[PDB]
């Protein structure tokens, strides 16, 4: 019964963000700035309907979805790719597959304790982020 991810979440760790960005072909100059940043994530969730806003001083990225409903996603101001995205529940873990030109691209997001965990995958690279609730 930990599917409720509502809140404002502040990043406390960001492991292998460098490798994940390189797997997405982010250029070096962009990576050099992006790797330093503390991200904030605001999740507005009504059951299976999610509105998410991820913010930083350098980039912001918003995505809304309903669990179980495939949608077109354009990762504007990140890697700027078009994918078909589907978010599902595996237990109380939110799982996203982003089908497109990059193999094995997706993410998983879940609550444990008072922390939000987010694992981002692209190819053979996994980035592990942890956020603390504000």
Ligand X SMILES: CCCCC/C=C\C/C=C\C/C=C\C/C=C\CCCCOC(CO)CO
Contact set with ligand X (CB under 6 A): 21, 24, 26, 30, 34, 37, 39, 41, 52, 54, 56, 58-61, 63, 78-79, 107, 109, 118, 120
Question: What angle (nearest 5°) sits at the alpha carbon of residue 74, between those of residues 73 and 80?
Answer: 145
Closest residue to ligand X, based on beta-carbon distance: 34
**Smallest separation (angstroms) from ligand X to the CB of 50:** 8
**Smallest separation (angstroms) from ligand X to the CB of 1:** 20
Tell me whether residue 1 or residue 19 sits nearer to ligand X (CB atom).
Answer: 19
- The pair of three-digit structure tokens given for residue 68, joined into one six-digit string: 């179980």
Could you tell me which of 67, 74, 68, 132 has the C-alpha nearest to residue 101?
A: 74
- CB contact at 8 A, 117 and 97: no
Binding site, annotated residues for all-trans-retinol: 41, 109
């Amino acid at each position: 019964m930990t599917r409720d991810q509502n809140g404002t979440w502040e990043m406390e760790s960001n492991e292998n963000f460098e490798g994940y960005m390189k797997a997405l072909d982010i250029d070096f100059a962009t990576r050099k700035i992006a790797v330093r940043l503390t991200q904030t994530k605001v999740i507005d969730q009504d059951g299976d309907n999610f509105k998410t806003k991820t913010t930083s001083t350098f980039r912001n990225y918003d995505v809304d979805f309903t669990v179980g409903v495939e949608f077109d996603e354009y990762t504007k101001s990140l890697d700027n790719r078009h994918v078909k995205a589907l978010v599902t529940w595996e237990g109380d873990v939110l799982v996203c597959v982003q089908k497109g030109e990059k193999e094995n691209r997706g993410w998983k997001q879940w609550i444990e304790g008072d922390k939000l965990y987010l694992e981002l995958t692209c190819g053979d690279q996994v980035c592990r982020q942890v956020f603390k609730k504000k």
